[PDB]
Write an enzyme that holds these catalytic residues in place. Structure first.
Site, PDB file in Angstrom:
ATOM      1  N   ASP A   1      -1.175   5.680  -5.819  1.00  0.00           N
ATOM      2  CA  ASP A   1      -1.630   4.770  -4.609  1.00  0.00           C
ATOM      3  C   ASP A   1      -1.881   3.209  -5.257  1.00  0.00           C
ATOM      4  OD1 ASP A   1      -2.820   3.627  -2.355  1.00  0.00           O
ATOM      5  OD2 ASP A   1      -4.664   4.985  -2.350  1.00  0.00           O
TER       6      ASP A   1
ATOM      7  N   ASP B   1       0.759  -1.217   0.047  1.00  0.00           N
ATOM      8  CA  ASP B   1       0.110  -0.118  -0.105  1.00  0.00           C
ATOM      9  C   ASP B   1       0.757   1.119   0.012  1.00  0.00           C
ATOM     10  OD1 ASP B   1      -1.984   1.700   0.325  1.00  0.00           O
ATOM     11  OD2 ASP B   1      -2.909   1.089   2.260  1.00  0.00           O
TER      12      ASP B   1
END
Ligand SMILES: COc1cccc(-c2cccc([C@@]3(c4ccccc4)NC(=N)N(C)C3=O)c2)c1
Length: 390
Positions: free
Chosen positions: A232, A36
Site C-alpha cells: 500500500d 494509492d
C-alpha cells in the site's frame, strides 16, 4: 530507461503521500493526485476545503457527466463523501492518452485531506472488488487499459530523501516515478523477483518468513498474513498484525539494546534525535521479509534498513539534530507494506501476470556499510499454509 516521459513524475514523501499530476475535464483542470495502491476510487476534492488551494469544478467541464449517485466512504480516521460522475482524464507526465473515467467529486470530508500535502485527490490503483459503493464502479486503471493500448502494468519508485524536506524543498524535489504501462530499468539495480498476487482486491501477497538481523522471528507464518498482507503506497508505515508487531519490536529492541529508547518512540508517537550526522544506523537491525515465489516451494527476500523504517522528521526546535519517528506500527487488519518499505524498492504491479515484482531501488537511502537487498531463491515448504482464510 525506456520511459523517460514518466521518470521523475512523482513528488511528496512518506508522511504525506506521493502524488502525480493529472488533468480532469474540458478544458483540462490540473490537480495533484495521491498515488494509492490501497484503494480503488479516483476521488477528487470538488468543493472548497481549508487544506485545498484548488479543486475540480464540474460546472466548468463540457465533458462532465453526472451519474446521479452519491458515495459515502467512512473509515476509522475519518471519511469522504461525494457525487459520482465521469469525465476525460489525462496524466501529463504519463502515457499520451486521454480516457473517460469515473470520478467521485468529494463534497464533504473529515480528516481526509492533509495540510501542506499539495494533493487534491486520490488515485485508487487497486481492484474493483474494493471500489465504493461497489464493484460496478470501474477503477481508473481498468478504464485506462480497456480504452487504450497501455499494457496492464504499472511500477512505482518512491524516493525517500533520507532527511527532512521543508515546504519549499518538498515542492521542488523529485519524489519518485510512476511508470504507467511498463518497467524502467534505470530505476533499479540487480534483479526483479516476483511474488504472486494472492487475490485481486487489494494488492494481496503472502509473507512466509521474517528475520531481524538474520534471526528468524519464528512465528507460525499464518500470523504474518493475519488477516491479509498488502502492498500500500497510501499507508506511511510498515504495519504488522498485533502479535507480529509485539514480537518484531521485542527483537528490534534486543538488537539495538546498546541504546535505550522511551516507550513513546516504539509506539511511533515520539521522535528520537541525535547530534547532526551521528545517527547510529549500525545499532539498528536490518529486517527481511520473505515472500512466496512464482516457483513451487521457492521464496525470495526483501531486506530493509533502519534508513527505511526510521522516518526523518524535523525536530520540534528545528535544531541541527537528525530526528526520526519509528515507522513500524501495529495493525488489527493485517500486514501493510507501506511507503517506508516501498522507498527501499522499485515495485512492479504486474496486473497482467497477477504478480508483484521487487528490486533494490536506485534511490533507496543507505550507508557505506549496508544496502537494501532483494535476493533468492530460498527453499520454503507449505507456503500456501501461510495464507489466512476466514
Ligand atoms: C503515504 O501515503 C499517505 C500518507 C498520508 C496520507 C495518505 C492518505 C490520505 C487520505 C486517504 C488515504 C487512504 C484512504 C483511501 C480511500 C478511502 C479512505 C482512506 N488510502 C490508503 N491506502 N489508506 C490506508 C488510507 O487511509 C491515505 C496517504
Amino acid at each position: 530507461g525506456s520511459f523517460v516521459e514518466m521518470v521523475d513524475n512523482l513528488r511528496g514523501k512518506s508522511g504525506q503521500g506521493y502524488y502525480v499530476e493529472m488533468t480532469v475535464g474540458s478544458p483540462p483542470q490540473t490537480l495533484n493526485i495521491l498515488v494509492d495502491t490501497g484503494s480503488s476510487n479516483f476521488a477528487v476534492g470538488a468543493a472548497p476545503h481549508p487544506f485545498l488551494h484548488r479543486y475540480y469544478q464540474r460546472q466548468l467541464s463540457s465533458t462532465y457527466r453526472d451519474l446521479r449517485k452519491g458515495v459515502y466512504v467512512p473509515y476509522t480516521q475519518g471519511k469522504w463523501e461525494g457525487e459520482l460522475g465521469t469525465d476525460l482524464v489525462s496524466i501529463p507526465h504519463g502515457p499520451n492518452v486521454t480516457v473517460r473515467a469515473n470520478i467521485a467529486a468529494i463534497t464533504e470530508s473529515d480528516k481526509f485531506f492533509i495540510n501542506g500535502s499539495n494533493w487534491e485527490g486520490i488515485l485508487g490503483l487497486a481492484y474493483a472488488e474494493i471500489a465504493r459503493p461497489d464493484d460496478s464502479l470501474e477503477p481508473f486503471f481498468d478504464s485506462l487499459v480497456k480504452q487504450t493500448h497501455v499494457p496492464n502494468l504499472f511500477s512505482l519508485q518512491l524516493c525517500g530523501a533520507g532527511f527532512p524536506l521543508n515546504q519549499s524543498e518538498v515542492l521542488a524535489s523529485v519524489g519518485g516515478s510512476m511508470i504507467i504501462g511498463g518497467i524502467d530499468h534505470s530505476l533499479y539495480t540487480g534483479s526483479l523477483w516476483y511474488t504472486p498476487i494472492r487475490r485481486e482486491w487489494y494488492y494481496e501477497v503472502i509473507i512466509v518468513r521474517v528475520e531481524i538481523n538474520g534471526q528468524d522471528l519464528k512465528m507460525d507464518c499464518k500470523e504474518y498474513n493475519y488477516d491479509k498482507s498488502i502492498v500500500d503506497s497510501g499507508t506511511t508505515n510498515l504495519r504488522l498484525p498485533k502479535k507480529v508487531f509485539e514480537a518484531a519490536v521485542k527483537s528490534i529492541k534486543a538488537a539495538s539494546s546498546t541504546e535505550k529508547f522511551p516507550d513513546g518512540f516504539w509506539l511511533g508517537e515520539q521522535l528520537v534525535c541525535w547530534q547532526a550526522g551521528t545517527t547510529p544506523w549500525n545499532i539498528f537491525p536490518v529486517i527481511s521479509l520473505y515472500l512466496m515465489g512464482e516457483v513451487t516451494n521457492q521464496s525470495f527476500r526483501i531486506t530493509i534498513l533502519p534508513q527505511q523504517y526510521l522516518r526523518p522528521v524535523e525536530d520540534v526546535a528545528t535544531s541541527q539534530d537528525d530526528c526520526y519517528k519509528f515507522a513500524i506500527s501495529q495493525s488489527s487488519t493485517g500486514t501493510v507494506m507501506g511507503a517506508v518499505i516501498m522507498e527501499g524498492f522499485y515495485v512492479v504491479f504486474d496486473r497482467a501476470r497477477k504478480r508483484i515484482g521487487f528490486a533494490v531501488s536506485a534511490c533507496h537511502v543507505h550507508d557505506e556499510f549496508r544496502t537494501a537487498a532483494v535476493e533468492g531463491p530460498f527453499v520454503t515448504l507449505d507456503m500456501e499454509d501461510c495464507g489466512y482464510n476466514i
